[PDB]
Design a protein around this ligand. Structure first.
Ligand SMILES: COC(=O)/C=C(\C)[C@@]12O[C@]13c1cc(O)c4c(c1N[C@H]2C#C/C=C\C#C[C@H]3O)C(=O)c1ccccc1C4=O
Length: 481
């Protein structure tokens, strides 16, 4: 493995020009700048691309202690600049007082040299796509790969987590900082592990929240999901079953689940299903629910949605705005393309299609909610380029001074087992905070858990870390322990 420090250093001498972020409503309130990075760090004098940065300066200059870099997006496919705006609105005031918060879109999406390939709306849901039948899905996923191959072949070798880690080093140098702090979620926690593994002597304080397993790269991210999807759905069903009076879905978790399964039975046989006046298909009937289950505070929304698919017409106004937020528009395309490129650019997927059919059929039986969608054939199996570098070896020689891991005990897409594995791999420099009785993605600061907020703030502000892993309770749990 090679760091390519010479090429990184070559681009660290930049001094970006910051101005108000005036060209996008969600970013008003922030400054914006552009940076150049090489496409290929083995070819520093070759082709380059531009990254879009945003910043919110420390509100108390006399107390400023450094830069807090936000990992470039939570779930892979999402924009880091938009995450930074969200965080500026919800981080503790004292964190905002002492840190310049800097965020960025990683290479190939958003404000950072976006790549689009003509993907149709259905194609942008390739990750959670539920198959008609296996032969149809082979063709569906192969054709997704075909579009990216045709329109982006020349940059696909350079879509990797290690290159984003080098990009982070360029940002750090450009900001003029010897050390930076880091806050990351989901894919941002894999990037945080990689960047600290490669360059962690330059880390100050590091918080990773809702943790990618180090074992996942990258098909395990998919094949570990269905059991956690089933568990999260069942937890909601228990919550719904205690509320039959107000929801009308059933008085046992089995009955609520059968109500929902009846909606799946319908889309899985091209029988019409609508939520308000908006049609569901095999994928959306499951993905709308996955989207809700990313936070157990959405349980009421999900009751309204399932009720509206079974009987009703209208949804409650609140639910309509939240669903319109989340779906309403097509999934942002360049993020879909970058998500494909990274998942296949980091690591070579199996290419034998019989493996996927076997796995799809087994997972459809053991975990029906999302088994077939997660374990079956996916576009990286047909990818036109191999990885340019081996996967980073994460391990207890990680040079970061300290890493705090934050994890909701019942989170779905990044489960507690994944955080525990990351803790084992990173070794004694890391500590794990588990938040009990909480099925939520991105705990600090978004959930408002007093215990997590207090412990993370004490680390970021004062450098306090517990002596060993700790648990904190949820004082307002959606269901009993
Ligand atoms: C790569 O590191 C991670 O830990 C990533 C994840 C746990 C996920 O980001 C991933 C998702 C990919 C999507 O395409 C998602 C979503 C992702 N969430 C995480 C997941 C998962 C399981 C397979 C995957 C993946 C990642 O690309 C997602 O939650 C959605 C919710 C509601 C609307 C749409 C979606 C999506 O389309």
């Amino acid at each position: 493995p090679h760091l390519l420090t010479d090429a990184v250093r070559a681009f660290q001498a930049q001094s970006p020009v910051w101005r108000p972020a005036d060209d996008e409503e969600a970013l008003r309130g922030l400054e914006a700048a552009e940076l150049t990075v090489p496409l290929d760090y083995r070819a520093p004098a070759g082709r380059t691309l531009t990254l879009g940065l945003v910043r919110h300066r420390a509100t108390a200059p006399e107390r400023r202690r450094g830069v807090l870099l936000v990992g470039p997006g939570d779930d892979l496919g999402n924009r880091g600049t938009l995450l930074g705006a969200q965080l500026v609105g919800q981080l503790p005031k004292e964190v905002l007082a002492q840190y310049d918060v800097v965020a960025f879109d990683h290479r190939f999406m958003g404000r950072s040299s976006p790549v689009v390939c003509g993907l149709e709306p259905e194609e942008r849901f390739w990750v959670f796509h539920h198959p008609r039948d296996f032969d149809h899905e082979v063709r569906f996923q192969a054709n997704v790969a075909a579009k990216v191959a045709e329109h982006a072949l020349d940059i696909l070798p350079y879509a990797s987590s290690r290159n984003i880690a080098r990009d982070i080093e360029v940002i750090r140098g450009a900001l003029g900082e010897d050390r930076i702090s880091y806050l990351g979620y989901s894919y941002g926690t894999y990037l945080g592990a990689v960047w600290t593994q490669m360059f962690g002597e330059h880390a100050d304080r590091v918080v990773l929240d809702s943790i990618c397993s180090p074992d996942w790269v990258w098909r395990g991210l998919f094949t570990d999901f269905p059991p956690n999807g089933e568990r999260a759905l069942t937890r909601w069903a228990r919550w719904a079953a205690a509320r039959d009076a107000d929801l009308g879905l059933g008085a046992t978790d089995g009955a609520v689940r059968a109500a929902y399964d009846g909606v799946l039975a319908r889309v899985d046989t091209d029988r019409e299903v609508t939520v308000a006046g908006f049609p569901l298909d095999r994928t959306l009937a499951r993905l709308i629910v996955v989207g809700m289950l990313n936070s157990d505070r959405n349980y009421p929304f999900l009751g309204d949605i399932v009720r509206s698919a079974v009987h009703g017409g209208q949804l409650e106004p609140a639910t309509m705005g939240f669903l319109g937020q989340m779906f309403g528009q097509p999934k942002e395309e360049s993020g879909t393309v970058a998500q494909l490129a990274i998942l296949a650019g980091d690591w070579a997927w199996p290419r034998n299609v019989d493996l996927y059919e076997r796995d799809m059929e087994r997972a459809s039986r053991t975990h029906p909610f999302t088994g077939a969608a997660m374990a079956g054939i996916k576009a990286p199996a047909f990818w036109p380029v191999p990885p340019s570098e081996p996967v980073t070896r994460l391990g207890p020689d990680n040079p970061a001074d300290s890493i705090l891991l934050v994890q909701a005990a019942d989170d779905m897409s990044t489960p507690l087992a994944a955080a525990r594995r990351m803790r084992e791999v990173l070794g004694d420099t890391s500590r794990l905070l588990t938040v009990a009785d909480t099925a939520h993605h991105r705990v600090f600061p978004f959930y408002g858990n007093p215990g997590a907020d207090e412990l993370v703030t004490a680390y970021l502000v004062d450098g306090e870390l517990p002596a060993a892993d700790v648990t904190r309770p949820n004082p307002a749990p959606m269901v009993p322990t």
